[PDB]
Every structure is written in C-alpha cells, then in structure tokens.
Design a protein around this nucleic acid. Structure first.
Lengths: 52, 108, 126, 150, 51, 139
RNA sequence: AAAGGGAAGCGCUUGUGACCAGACUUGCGCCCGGCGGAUCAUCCGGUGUUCUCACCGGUGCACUCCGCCGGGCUCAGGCCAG
RNA sequence: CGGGACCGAGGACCGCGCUCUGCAAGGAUGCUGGCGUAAUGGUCACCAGCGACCCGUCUUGAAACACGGACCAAGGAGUCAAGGUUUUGCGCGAGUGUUUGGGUGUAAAACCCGCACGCGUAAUGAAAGUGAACGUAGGUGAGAGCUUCGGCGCAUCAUCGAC
C-alpha cells in the first residue's frame, strides 16, 4: 500500500483519468439549495387523478 | 460474435514520366510551419520566453534534430528573436522570422 | 393464505395454437410454427383454418402469470429460497423444483407452513 | 376502415444515450430533472447534447474558445458538451472559465496556468442551474474525413 | 489532507500505524471499460483448434 | 467523490450476487432488503442508510447501517434484538425508521416485516385431512 | 374404450362418457368468564445509537401487561343463482 | 310513462354540479337462496350443426402444367481470414499505436520498456520545383444559446472577398 503510488507514478504515458462527474451524490446535487431555489413550482404529483 | 449476426434472425426465412529505380530517401524533406515553431522549444523555457523572463538570450532551434528539413510559412510569430537552422526554407517563412528578429541559417 | 384481491382472471383463448399439418405428420411437432409458404391458407387467413397467434390475445396485465388461486409461481430449491417469500404470502406461491429430494421437500413445506406460504406441489414424494 | 393518406411519424432523434457510462447516466438523470423543472432553454440543449454520439460531439479547441471569448464575452462561462483540446498554435491562453464534458491533460494544465477554471457539467449545474451568463460552443461537425468523402 | 487507512497486526488488532490511501482508489469506476477490457483479455490464453 | 449510492446502484442494478430473477419477478437475497425486492428504494446494500430485520430465537433482530463506519464492515451495523411484546417491537422499529429522518420511507415495510416474522414464530395449526373426490380417487 | 351407408384428418360451438387441477375447511377485531406467568407505566444505573431514540440489570404485586381455554357479537371469507 | 337485452372498466378524499339533513353529481351496490363438491371450471374420446383443397418448389401478370414428398430417428446448408466503407460504444488527443523485439513472470497469461516505423499533423504539379493571415482569421443575410436588452453570436447554410 506504500508502494502503490510509486507504481502508478512510474507508468509512462498514463495518468489517472479525470472523471466527467465531480460529485457522484445525485441526491445532494438535486436537493441542494442552489438548484432547488430556482425551480418552477411542481405541475403535478406522482399520481394523477382520473378526470373523466 | 455469431449470435449477433443477421443470419441467426434469418434462420427459417432463407500519367507523365516513368521513374525507374525510385529511391524515396532522395526526396525526404518533411516540413514544419512557423506557427508550430515554438512547440519545438521545451514547455518550461518556452513559457519563460513567451512571458518575457529571457530578454538577453535567443533560442537556437535545429529542425533536423526534430526531423524536419524545410521551414514553411503558415501562421505568425511572436516578437521574439529565434535562430532557426534548416536545410530548406520558404521565402515567407524567412521573411516572418526576420520580422520576428531572428535569422534562418542553412545547414546540410 | 388467501391471495390478495384481484380482478377476475380472463383467458381470451384456452386452446393451444397447433402447427399446420402436425395432425397428419408425426415428424411434425404440434408446437407452433408460422407458415411461410406464399400460397398457404393458414398464413393467408382463409376462414375455417387454424388461427395464428398474435398480440391481440394477450392477457390482462393485472392478472398475467397468475394461477387460478391468484398467486404467482416462484420456483424454490431450499428453505432459504422459500424464505424469500416472507413478505409475499398473499401474492406469491412456492413451487418446489423437481430435483429436490424428499427430506429437503419436507423441510421446505414445514417452513412454508410457518411463513403462511402456499406450496403448489406440497403432496409430492410422500 | 379509415383512409389515412398521411402517416404518423415515430421520433427520429435520440431520447437517451447509447453509452453505458454510469457517470454519464447520472449526468443525464440530473439534466432530465433540470430540463423538466426549469424554463431555461440552455438545460434542454445540454440534455440533448448529452444524448449525442461522438461524431455529433466534435472537439473544441482553446483557440476556438479564445476566438469566442472576444467582444464582451470575457466574463461568460464557456459551456462545451464535448472534449476540449489544446492548440499549441495558440501561444497565449487568456483567462477563462470553461465547463466541459472532458478536458485533455494539456488543455486543463494550460487553462489552470493561465488562471482560469475548469468545471464538470455537474459543477456547472450547481453554479449556473439556469445557464445564466454562459457561452455555449460547438466544434466543427463537418470537419471529418468521411464528411469530406460524402 | 488525504485519508488514511489503519494497519492491522498478525493478531487482527490495529497496530497504531496508519498509511495514506493511494490516489488510485479515487479513480472512476467504469464497468463498461472493465467489461470491454475483460472480454478482450480473457481470450489471450486460448489455444487454437481445427479439424 | 467517485463513489455514491447512485453510482453503486448504477453499477449493480442489472446484476449482483443477491439477485434472484425468474419469470414472475425479480427478488433479492440482501440482508438489508426489506420486502426482498430488487429496487433502489429497497437495495439496502446500495443505500447509505438502510434497515434489515431477521428472526431471532424469540422475537426480531434489527440491523441498521452506521453512516460513519461504511469502510469498516465489522463495526458498520447497529444491532438491536427485540424479544418482548409485539407492539413494543413495532414502536421501537418505527421510531428508528422515522423519528430522526433515517429512511422514513421504509417504516411501513419495516413494521410489516417485523409483524411477519413474529407471526411466523407462532405455533402452526394442524391442517384438515384431505377429502377424496370423484370416482377413481375415492374408489 | 370407441367410431365406421363410396376417404379421413382440421376450425367454431354445445352435449355425452371417462378423467382431473384449483377453491373451501375459517381468520381478524371487540365484550365477558376461567386459568398460567410477570420481558405492564414510571424511576434509577450501564451500554449502544440516527443524540433522541432504544436495549440490558433493579422496580411492578396484579383495575396493569402477555399467551391459553370457554362462550357471545361485528366484519371479511368459496361455487352457482334470484 | 312502461317492457326487454348486454355490460359494472376504476378503487381513500380531491372535480363539475344538483332537486342540497342528502343525491341517480369524475365507472355497482344492497338484500336473499341452494350448494360447499367434481356442482361450477378444465382435459381427452366421440356424435351433432355450421365452416374448411395437399404441402413445398417453379413460372409468369397470374393460374394450370411440371418437379419433390411410403414412414421414423440422427446428420444436414451465408462460415472463417485479409482488405475497404458507413454507423455504435470506449481510451487518448495534434497526436496516436506496449505485444517485430527487449525486460519480467506464480510461465503460451498478466505486468513493464523504448529506438525506429505506420497513420495523422500540407498541399499542388508530368516533372524540376514551389508551398497556405490585408483585416480582433475578413464582409453580408440567416441562425440555437446567452445578454448589461444596446447587443454578442455556436454548429451549419447561402453569398462576396483574401491566401
């Protein structure tokens, strides 16, 4: 476990890849204040009443 | 793989001159444009040159060591004097190097 | 126990779809094959001929895979398999796999009786 | 019977990525939520480009970004839904705030050395959930060998 | 700072030593890449057959 | 970071070792899965906060995830055994599922699972004898 | 066992005869009476936790809890029908 | 205002309403009887009414002709390689490609290494040869998106210029 970092530094032509997503916690992102404060009001519920 | 092929789904339904003894090594002259000239300088010293931390020294670039024989003239150069050693050069490339303040030297 | 309340089970067609001319040739299995001959009367759907299966015969989505008691069959091989039906004794019934020995069947039947789970084939190997 | 001379047309655009990238799936979920719950057209365009294939996401270079950063755009956040590449013909990189699907190593290094910022699209969703003050940039679609051969 | 990991002894108890977690443990987890590489790699010890 | 419950669910939603897939439904063998059903809501091994109930010799045994010990499996579970009145067991299970915001969406399933286990622990009744019917079976 | 007045076989729908799979057998909730026990409520100490919720040890002294056994009552229960 | 037939999808409440203690108003309830088993239901055999050409191939526009088929089991026909091309997924990206070879190995695997080389980064001409910025990499009309609401304008298209 102490040699692993040197192992990955010695690989020529390879770097540890950058992810396309910075924060994998989708619930944290969606329910954060920054996103929630700018949303439109909900246009319905998870279940819809039958009209006719 | 055989299981993904359409055959499985179809189961049940079926001038000028001639040059004798051409030697390509005679005509070896790879070219580089002046807009890629500074990329031959290593990144750190290139960054110092472009920032302006080297006001009393000029880079000498050997194109043959990088594998190029002719300096071509696409692009523009910054106002930094560069000595370029090349086997061949175009007139526009020499003109742009001279306006940048350097010199094109001829080598074999 | 009794199954959860459900709509009446409707089978649009109970008769199987027999292969054309399988009644006249023993080398032809009765399992359905779509006729692909250009002049075939079953493929062209002349009246008086065998019907062909189609999506219009599909069962109600609320009652699909239900046995007449209202449960859905779940194949079980041991006591740990039958214990997966702890929260579904009103919707799922256990069917013991054919290769389970008689002693293990006794253990499965005892556990399913404790859990209140219907066993479809509880009288086998007795 | 009913005479229908015209024909109902099934959708001819992607509704989901063909990719099996799990992080792209998470990004698609996030931008599905944003394009359903906001009114900003930016989010709908971003979601559609997250659906797209690689020939429909050509790379954007730093010199292209620097070209579009002129004339009053120097403070807008640049948004690219493809790879951002480095252009070594561009000797001086301006300061820029760029959010991209992915960066090359040299492009990220040169942006950070010039003093700008690189963001992922979920960080972009956190900071600009309505796409305010942004510059949405695409690379050259027809700059391909096959498209030349068409 | 970077996270640490506990070192356990031969008796199964912690020794009091910790080590810095290597950066490879924060790499993206890509099952599609892993499946592609595994499908390719598992065929590399195959011996040929022919009639 | 690179790891979250959403990421683990995307990794293991199509196959994992707990999956039991048949024609009539997909079930899960996960210990932290109330209702034993394969979904993100009930995937206890995926979720950061999760509950699971097993029988004991008498009564039920409830495990809950500890969020600060996710990388320490031997000390990651908070375990309580309820061997008392069923109403007290239901009250405590609903309290640890809903009172502090620890998976309030799971409290109905948790109380139902505890009730099912306690009901299964009762003595079974003898079944009536099978009535023979017809002509070949009767004679 | 059955059918057969110059073909059989097949589709739809009854009937006859033979042979079968299910379903059902009672459950839940109250009100009384009789038993058998105190893992009733509160408080104290320890421990764990989601830090306010629990478990464990003492405390109950039986108008409180938990099972069982007799009744009575309500509700829900299978098939075909009016 | 009567007489008859077929049907009862949905499953807490929310609505539109009315004749407003309530209702026929966003889909059937209430009351009662027999039976609780082969009674209902199902399978098989047969009779009855009605329905119903022998399959495959070939041909042309189609039939007809013609060809194959006594019966059953097992076998039985769009494969692999090289090279292109378009599209999908993936890695890296003005670079890219470890595996000819070398190092190493728990030994035909996995891991590691780099010179050369291929393709791309420049074209054009028979060839000798020459070789891509007037301009914020140009003007004009569109153009998603953004905007300080004046504009800025991606991709792409059209058109006039420049090298």
């Amino acid at each position: 476990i102490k040699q692993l970092d040197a192992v990955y530094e010695s690989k020529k032509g390879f770097f540890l890849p950058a992810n396309i997503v910075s924060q994998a916690d989708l619930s944290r992102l969606i329910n954060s204040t920054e996103i929630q404060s700018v949303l439109r009001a909900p246009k319905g519920e998870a279940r819809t009443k039958r009209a006719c | 793989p055989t299981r993904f092929s359409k055959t499985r789904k179809h189961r049940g339904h079926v001038v000028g001159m001639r040059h004798f003894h051409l030697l390509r090594n005679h005509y070896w002259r790879p070219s580089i444009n002046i807009d890629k000239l500074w990329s031959l300088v290593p990144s750190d010293v290139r960054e110092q040159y472009l920032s302006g931390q080297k006001k009393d020294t000029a880079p000498v670039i050997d194109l043959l060591s990088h594998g190029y024989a002719k300096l071509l003239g696409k692009g523009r150069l910054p106002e930094i004097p560069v000595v370029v050693r090349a086997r061949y050069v175009s007139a526009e490339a020499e003109r742009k190097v001279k306006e940048a303040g350097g010199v094109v030297e001829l080598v074999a | 126990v009794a199954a959860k309340k459900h709509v009446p089970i409707v089978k649009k067609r109970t008769k199987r779809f027999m292969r054309h001319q399988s009644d006249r040739f023993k080398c032809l299995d009765s399992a359905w094959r779509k006729p692909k001959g250009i002049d075939n009367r079953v493929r062209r759907r002349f009246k008086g001929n065998l019907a062909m299966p189609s999506i219009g015969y599909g069962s109600n989505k609320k009652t699909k895979h239900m046995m007449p008691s209202g449960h859905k069959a779940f194949l079980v091989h041991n006591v740990k398999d039958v214990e997966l039906l702890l929260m579904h004794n009103r919707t799922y019934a256990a069917e013991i796999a054919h290769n389970v020995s008689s002693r293990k069947r006794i253990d499965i039947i005892t556990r399913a009786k404790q859990l209140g789970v219907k066993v479809t084939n509880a009288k086998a190997k007795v | 019977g009913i005479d229908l001379r015209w024909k109902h047309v099934r959708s001819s655009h992607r509704k989901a990525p063909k990719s099996d990238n799990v992080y792209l799936k998470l990004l698609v979920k996030l931008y599905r939520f944003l394009a359903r719950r906001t009114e900003a057209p930016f989010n709908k365009v971003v979601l559609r480009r997250l659906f797209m294939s690689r020939i429909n996401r050509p790379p954007v270079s730093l010199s292209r970004i620097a070209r579009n950063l002129k004339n009053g755009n120097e403070k807008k956040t640049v948004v690219v839904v493809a790879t951002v590449t480095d252009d070594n013909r561009l000797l001086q990189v301006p300061k820029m705030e760029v959010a991209a699907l992915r960066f090359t190593a040299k492009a990220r290094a040169r942006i950070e050395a010039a003093g700008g910022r690189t963001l992922t699209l979920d960080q972009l969703a956190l900071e600009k959930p309505t796409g305010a003050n942004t510059l949405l940039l695409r690379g050259p679609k027809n700059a391909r060998e096959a498209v030349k051969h068409f | 700072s970077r996270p640490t990991v506990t070192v356990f002894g031969a008796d199964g108890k912690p020794t009091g030593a910790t080590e810095v977690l290597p950066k490879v443990f924060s790499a993206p987890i890509r099952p599609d890449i892993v499946k592609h590489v595994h499908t390719g790699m598992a065929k590399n010890k195959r011996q040929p057959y022919a009639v | 970071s690179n790891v979250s419950a959403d990421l683990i669910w995307e990794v293991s939603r199509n196959y994992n070792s707990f999956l039991v897939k048949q024609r009539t439904g997909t079930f899960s063998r996960d210990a932290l899965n109330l209702t034993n059903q394969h979904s993100r809501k009930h995937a206890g091994f995926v979720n950061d906060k999760a509950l699971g109930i097993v029988p004991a010799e008498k009564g039920v045994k409830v495990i809950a995830k500890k969020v600060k010990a996710a990388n320490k499996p031997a000390s990651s579970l908070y375990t309580v055994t309820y061997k008392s009145t069923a109403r007290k067991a239901y009250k405590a299970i609903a309290s640890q599922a809903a009172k502090h915001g620890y998976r309030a969406d799971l409290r109905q399933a948790a109380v139902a699972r505890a009730s099912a286990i306690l009901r299964s622990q009762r003595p079974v009744k003898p079944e009536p004898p099978k009535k023979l019917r017809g002509a070949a079976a009767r004679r």
